[PDB]
């Protein structure tokens, strides 16, 4: 689609950076950005990245199963819901998850305003 | 204020109505509303309700396993992500589903602007 392609473009970029070094994701978040990771609530790039960095695993790889997006308003922002697998420490057994991002335009890219993450037992 | 309690109340109302009589979910949607039901994309209360009513089951029950909510902006709107089990008809084994709602404050209540729904398979 368009919003699915627009959302996918950014999401792939986001996960590519997450999988190579999640400590460098700061630029994709802003001061008012919020992260709710398995109920843990963080606000701001600093605290959000700290949380992601703190996650207990060396290597991680995201495998996307489904991705659905819609314009979050008439003005340019996008809402995307993703379900996929998290492969950690080079382990074959996947850890399924569901995630939602509220993306705000910034130049030809976006930054994350809302990030909601949940493990989703398989 | 309490967007967590707001989400609990709205989602409970929504799924209760969906499980009771989905043909009456119309007033929770508006003309601009968008529903992505798996591969189906609909806009407007009429088409959205039509799609939900077309689902060929006689009985359905939503069982929430996770619920998260964050303010979608500084102006009152809310983002809600839900994951849970969907029991269709007399099927014993439930299906996993994930859903995100972007709720807009309609004066003194809310309506769904964004509705993204997906069944998740292992």
């Amino acid at each position: 689609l368009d919003f699915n392609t627009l959302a996918q473009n950014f999401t792939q970029f986001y996960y590519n950076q997450f999988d190579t070094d999640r400590s460098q994701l700061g630029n994709l978040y802003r001061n008012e950005s919020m992260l709710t990771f398995e109920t843990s609530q963080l606000q701001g790039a600093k605290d959000i990245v700290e949380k992601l960095v703190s996650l207990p695993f060396q290597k991680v790889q995201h495998r996307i199963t489904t991705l659905d997006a819609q314009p979050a308003s008439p003005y340019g922002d996008v809402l995307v819901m993703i379900t996929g697998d998290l492969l950690i420490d080079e382990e074959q057994n996947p850890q399924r998850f569901s995630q939602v991002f509220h993306l705000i335009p910034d130049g030809n890219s976006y930054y994350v305003f809302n990030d909601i993450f949940r493990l989703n037992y398989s | 204020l309490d967007f967590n309690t707001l989400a609990q109340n709205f989602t409970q109302f929504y799924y209760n109505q969906f499980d009771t009589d989905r043909s009456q979910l119309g007033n929770l949607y508006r003309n601009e509303s968008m529903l992505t039901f798996e591969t189906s994309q609909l806009q407007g209360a009429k088409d959205i309700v039509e799609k939900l009513v077309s689902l060929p089951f006689q009985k359905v029950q939503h069982r929430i396993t996770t619920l998260d909510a964050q303010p979608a902006s500084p102006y009152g709107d809310v983002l809600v992500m839900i994951t849970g089990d969907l029991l269709i008809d007399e099927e014993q084994n439930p299906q996993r589903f994930s859903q995100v709602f972007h709720l807009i404050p309609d004066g003194n209540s809310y309506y769904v602007f964004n509705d993204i729904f997906r069944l998740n398979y292992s």
């Binding site: 919020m34 609530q41 606000q43 | 967007f3 964050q70």
Partner: peptide, 5 residues
């Protein structure tokens, strides 16, 4: 504990 200014 999510605020805006």
């Amino acid at each position: 504990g999510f605020s805006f200014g």
